[PDB]
C-alpha cells in the first residue's frame, strides 16, 4: 500500500492519471520523482523546466555541478540526485528528442532505468516538448517497466485518448 490516490490501474504495475506532476510530487513525497531530463541536464522547459522552478532553481545548481564532474548523460540513460523538496530523489531519465532527430527505439532503453526503483512517479519519457507519440510513450511503457509506475499525464485531453486507446 502506498499513498498514491485517483490513478487509473492499466495493467498489474502501471497506473495513470491526470495531474501536474509538480503538485502530484509536492503532495506524495514520493521516494522518486523521474525527471524528462536531457544530456546537459539543462532543465529549461517541459517537466524539467517545471520541477526545477519548483525547486527554486536548486536541481538546476546540483545539475551543474554533476555535468562539470561526469560530463553529460548519454540518450536512453538516467542518473539518480537529489529530489529537493519534491521527493526523496529524482531520476534525470533522457528520452529520445525528436525535434533533434534522435532514435525513437532509444526510448525502450530510457524506461529500463525505472526498474532500478521499487515504485516512482514519473511522466510519458520523449512526450510533449520532446516530440514523441505519447500513445507510443505509453505503450513501451508498460512492455518495458516492471516495476510499480505512477505515471502523471498534465493534458487533460491527452489523457483521455491515452485512456481510451489503451490495449
Ligand atoms: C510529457 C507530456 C505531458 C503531457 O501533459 N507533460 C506533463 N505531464 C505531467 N506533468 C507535467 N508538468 C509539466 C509538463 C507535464
Ligand atoms: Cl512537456
Same mark, same amino acid.
Given at each position: 500500500v502506498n499513498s498514491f490516490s485517483g490513478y487509473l490501474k492499466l495493467t498489474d504495475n502501471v497506473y495513470i492519471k491526470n495531474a501536474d506532476i509538480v503538485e502530484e510530487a509536492k503532495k506524495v513525497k514520493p521516494t522518486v520523482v523521474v525527471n524528462a531530463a536531457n544530456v546537459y541536464l539543462? !532543465? *529549461? *522547459? *517541459?517537466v524539467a523546466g517545471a520541477l526545477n522552478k519548483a525547486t527554486n532553481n536548486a536541481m538546476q545548481v546540483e545539475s551543474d555541478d554533476y555535468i562539470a564532474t561526469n560530463g553529460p548523460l548519454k540518450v536512453g540513460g538516467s542518473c539518480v540526485l537529489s529530489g529537493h +523538496? $519534491?521527493?526523496? !530523489?529524482? $531520476?534525470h531519465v533522457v528520452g529520445p528528442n525528436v525535434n533533434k532527430g @534522435?532514435?525513437?527505439?532509444l526510448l525502450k532503453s530510457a524506461y529500463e +532505468?525505472? +526498474?532500478? !526503483? @521499487?515504485?516512482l512517479l514519473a511522466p510519458? $519519457?520523449?512526450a510533449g516538448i520532446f516530440g514523441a507519440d505519447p500513445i507510443h510513450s505509453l505503450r513501451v511503457c508498460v512492455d518495458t517497466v516492471r516495476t510499480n509506475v505512477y505515471l502523471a499525464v498534465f493534458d487533460k485531453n491527452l489523457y483521455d485518448k491515452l485512456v481510451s486507446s489503451f490495449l
Open positions: 539543462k !532543465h *529549461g *522547459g *517541459g +523538496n $519534491l521527493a526523496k !530523489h529524482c $531520476l @534522435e532514435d525513437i527505439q +532505468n525505472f +526498474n532500478q !526503483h @521499487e515504485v510519458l $519519457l520523449s
